[PDB]
Write a protein that holds these residues in place. Structure first.
Motif, PDB file in Angstrom:
ATOM      1  N   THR A  81       0.803  -1.211   0.000  1.00  0.00           N
ATOM      2  CA  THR A  81       0.000   0.000   0.000  1.00  0.00           C
ATOM      3  C   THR A  81       0.848   1.279   0.000  1.00  0.00           C
ATOM      4  O   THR A  81       1.386   1.682   1.031  1.00  0.00           O
ATOM      5  CB  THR A  81      -1.065  -0.039   1.143  1.00  0.00           C
ATOM      6  N   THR A 122      -8.837  -2.760   7.013  1.00  0.00           N
ATOM      7  CA  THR A 122      -8.728  -2.937   5.565  1.00  0.00           C
ATOM      8  C   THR A 122      -8.739  -4.424   5.157  1.00  0.00           C
ATOM      9  O   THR A 122      -7.979  -5.237   5.699  1.00  0.00           O
ATOM     10  CB  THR A 122      -7.527  -2.124   4.982  1.00  0.00           C
ATOM     11  N   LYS A 165     -11.260  -0.641   2.129  1.00  0.00           N
ATOM     12  CA  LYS A 165     -10.152   0.036   2.775  1.00  0.00           C
ATOM     13  C   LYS A 165     -10.578   1.299   3.522  1.00  0.00           C
ATOM     14  O   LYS A 165     -11.464   2.044   3.063  1.00  0.00           O
ATOM     15  CB  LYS A 165      -9.086   0.372   1.716  1.00  0.00           C
TER      16      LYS A 165
END
Ligand SMILES: COC1=C(OC)C(=O)C(CC=C(C)C)=C(C)C1=O
Lengths: 218, 148, 216
Positions: free
Chosen positions: A184, C177, C144
Motif C-alpha cells: 500500500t 482494511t 479500505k
C-alpha cells in the motif's frame, strides 16, 4: 457462577478419525430427580451462529449424525466425534444450564496432505488512484499447510515497509488455508518503478511461485 | 342434578384439600411452591359445587357451571407448569414464597414456606402436582364434556 | 422453516444507548421463550438476557442487570434488546436464540463501543490488463479505510458464493482494511457480469462495485 472450562484449545486430526475433547464444570450438573445432566454442546462453524449438537449430556438433536457422542456426568463431560468429515471444522462449546447459562472457552477442531498456493497479482483501481492513493494486492488461494513466506518484488529491488497480510481460517469444504498480501503506497510513489511481482515459498517445494505485472499500461 | 350431584362434589373437594392439609401438619412436609396458589384452585371448585348445591336450584345452576369451569381450567394450568417445572426445571428458578389478603386471612392453609429441597417422594412415580394435574382434568372434563 | 434475523446496531459511544430487535419468523412465536447471547472479540460466549414466553419474567447476568432490557412483542413477532449505559465491554456480536437449550440461533448484529465511524472505500480488482487468458479467472474486491468492524462483502447479491475468499480485516492505524478473491471459469467471466457488493452496517453504506476489464 459455574465455570465451564474445556481442554485443549485446539485439535488436529486427519479426516475420518475419532476425537474426544473434554468439558469440565466447577459445579456438579446432576439433579436428584432424574439423572439429568443439564449440559449442552454447541458446535460453531467459522463465522456462523453456534448450532445445537447435544443436549442434557447424552441426547443428540434433530439431524445430529450418531458420530458426535456425549458422555459425561457430574462435573465431567466429553464430546466424541468419530469419522471426522471435512465439514467438521469448528469450535465446540459446552454450556451449562443448571444454574443460569455458562459456556466453556471453546476447543478448535482444525483439520489435517499439502497443496500448492495459487497466486495472482492485482494492480490499483483507476478510481483509487484518481482519488489520491495506490494499493497492490495478490491472493494466495487454496494452499496448505499454513506456512508461506510471500515476498514482494519491485522489478527485482525488494522493499517491505507497508505490506499487510491475512490468512483465512482454514476452509471447511476443501479444508485448506488461503492468504492475501497488500502493498500500500501513496498515489505518486507508485509509478517510481515499472515491474511489480510477489512470490510464495510455501513448502510443497521451496521453488518460489512467482506472478508479475508491469505498470505503464495500468 | 339436585343438591346431590353437587354436594357430593362439594364434599369431594374437601376430600382432597384436607387430604393435602394432613401432609402440612402430620407428614410435615411443609412445602408449597405454587401449591398454595393451587389450594386456591380447589377453594374455587368448592364454590361451584357448594353453590350448584346450596339453593340449587335451576337459575343459579348456570352460574355454578362457569365457576366450576374457571378454577378447574385454572387448576390445570397451575398444576401443569408446576409439573413441567420438574420434567423441565428452568436454568433460573428462584425459590420464592410470599404473596384482599392472600397470606393474612388464614395462616394454617394460606402460608407458603417451600424452601427447596430438590427432592420429593410424592408417591407412585408421580408427584403431587403430577396427580393434581390429572384430578383437575377430572373436573374440567366433567364440567364441560360431561355437563355443558 | 424457522427463522431469526436480529438487527439494528453498529457503533455507540460509552455510556451510550441503542436497541436491537430480533425479527422472528416461522414458528409459534408466543409459545417459546427468548434469549440474547453475545460473543466477545475474544470469541468468548456470554448469555445476556432471557425473557419468558409471555413477557412475564425476564432474567439477566449481573453484568448487564440494570443496563439491559429484554422485551418482546408477539404482535409484530419481534424480540427486543434495549441496551443502555453502554460499557466498552459490551462490544460484541449479538445473537438472538431459542430454547425449549438454544436450538435456532440468529446470525448476529455486531455492536461496538468506542469513541468515530468511517464509511469504507470500495475499489474493484480487475486482473492483469494483458489479454493473457489462463483458465480459471480470479477477480477481486478491495475494502479500505473503515471503522468499525464488521463489513458484509457479497459477490453478485449472494449468488456467487461457491469459490470465494474474504480475508480478516487488519488494524493499521485505526482503520480496518480487507480484501476479497473470487475464482471462476473463463467462460463465466467477462461475458457474464460479476459484481462486488459491500455493506457497512455500522455506517449505512450499500456500495456496489462492478468488476470491469481494463480499457485505456
Ligand atoms: C408442595 O407439594 C405439594 C403438597 O404437599 C404439601 C400437596 O399436598 C399438594 C396437594 C395434594 C393433594 C392430595 C390435594 C400439591 C399439589 C403439592 O404440590
Amino acid at each position: 457462577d459455574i465455570v465451564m472450562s474445556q481442554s485443549p484449545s485446539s485439535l488436529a486430526v486427519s479426516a475420518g478419525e475419532k476425537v474426544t475433547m473434554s468439558c469440565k464444570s466447577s459445579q456438579s450438573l446432576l439433579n436428584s430427580r432424574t439423572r439429568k445432566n443439564y449440559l449442552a454442546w454447541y458446535q460453531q462453524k467459522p463465522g456462523q451462529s453456534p448450532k445445537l449438537l447435544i443436549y442434557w449430556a447424552s441426547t443428540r438433536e434433530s439431524g445430529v449424525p450418531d458420530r458426535f457422542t456425549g458422555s459425561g456426568s457430574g462435573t465431567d463431560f466429553t464430546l466424541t466425534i468419530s469419522s471426522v468429515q471435512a465439514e467438521d471444522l469448528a469450535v465446540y462449546y459446552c454450556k451449562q444450564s443448571y444454574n443460569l447459562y455458562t459456556f466453556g472457552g471453546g476447543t478448535k477442531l482444525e483439520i489435517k496432505a499439502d497443496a500448492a498456493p495459487t497466486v495472482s497479482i492485482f494492480p490499483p483501481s483507476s478510481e483509487q488512484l484518481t482519488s489520491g492513493g495506490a494499493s497492490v494486492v495478490c491472493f494466495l488461494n487454496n494452499f496448505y499447510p499454513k506456512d508461506i513466506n510471500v515476498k514482494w518484488k519491485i522489478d527485482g529491488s525488494e522493499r517491505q515497509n507497508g505490506v499487510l497480510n491475512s490468512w483465512t481460517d482454514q476452509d471447511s469444504k476443501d479444508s485448506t488455508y488461503s492468504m492475501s498480501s497488500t502493498l500500500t503506497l501513496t498515489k505518486d510513489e507508485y509509478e517510481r518503478h515499472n515491474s511489480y511481482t510477489c512470490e510464495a515459498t510455501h513448502k510443497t517445494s521451496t521453488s518460489p511461485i512467482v506472478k508479475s505485472f508491469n505498470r505503464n499500461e495500468c | 342434578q339436585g343438591r346431590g350431584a353437587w354436594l357430593l362434589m362439594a364434599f369431594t373437594a374437601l376430600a382432597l384439600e384436607l387430604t393435602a392439609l394432613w401432609f402440612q401438619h402430620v407428614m410435615l412436609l411443609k412445602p408449597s411452591v405454587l401449591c398454595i396458589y393451587e389450594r386456591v384452585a380447589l377453594f374455587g371448585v368448592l364454590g361451584a359445587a357448594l353453590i350448584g348445591a346450596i339453593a340449587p336450584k335451576t337459575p343459579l345452576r348456570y352460574v355454578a357451571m362457569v365457576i366450576w369451569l374457571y378454577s378447574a381450567f385454572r387448576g390445570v394450568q397451575l398444576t401443569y407448569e408446576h409439573t413441567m417445572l420438574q420434567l423441565y426445571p428452568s436454568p433460573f428458578a428462584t425459590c420464592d414464597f410470599m404473596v384482599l389478603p392472600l397470606d393474612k386471612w388464614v395462616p394454617q392453609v394460606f402460608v407458603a414456606s417451600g424452601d427447596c429441597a430438590e427432592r420429593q417422594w410424592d408417591f407412585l412415580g408421580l408427584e403431587m402436582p403430577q396427580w393434581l394435574l390429572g384430578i383437575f382434568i377430572a373436573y374440567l372434563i366433567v364440567a364441560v364434556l360431561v355437563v355443558i | 422453516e424457522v427463522q431469526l434475523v436480529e438487527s439494528g446496531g453498529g457503533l455507540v459511544k460509552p455510556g451510550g444507548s441503542l436497541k436491537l430487535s430480533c425479527a422472528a419468523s416461522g414458528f409459534a412465536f408466543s409459545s417459546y421463550d427468548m434469549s440474547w447471547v453475545r460473543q466477545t472479540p475474544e470469541k468468548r460466549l456470554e448469555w445476556v438476557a432471557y425473557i419468558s414466553s409471555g413477557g412475564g419474567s425476564t432474567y439477566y447476568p449481573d453484568t448487564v442487570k440494570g443496563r439491559f432490557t429484554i422485551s418482546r412483542d408477539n404482535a409484530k413477532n419481534t424480540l427486543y434488546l434495549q441496551m443502555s449505559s453502554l460499557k466498552s465491554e459490551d462490544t460484541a456480536m449479538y445473537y438472538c436464540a431459542r430454547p425449549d437449550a438454544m436450538d435456532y440461533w440468529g446470525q448476529g448484529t455486531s455492536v461496538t463501543v468506542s469513541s468515530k465511524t468511517t464509511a469504507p472505500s470500495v475499489y474493484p480488482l480487475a486482473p492483469v490488463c494483458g489479454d493473457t487468458t489462463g483458465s480459471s479467472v480470479t477477480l477481486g474486491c478491495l475494502v479500505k479505510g473503515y471503522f468499525p468492524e464488521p463489513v458484509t462483502l457479497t459477490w453478485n447479491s449472494g449468488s456467487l458464493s461457491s469459490g470465494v475468499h474474504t480475508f480478516p480485516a487488519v488494524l493499521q492505524s485505526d482503520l480496518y482494511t480487507l480484501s476479497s478473491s473470487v475464482t471462476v471459469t473463463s467462460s463465466t467471466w467477462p461475458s457474464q457480469s460479476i459484481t462486488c457488493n459491500v455493506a457497512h452496517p455500522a455506517s449505512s453504506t450499500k456500495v456496489d462495485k462492478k468488476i470491469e476489464p481494463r480499457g485505456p
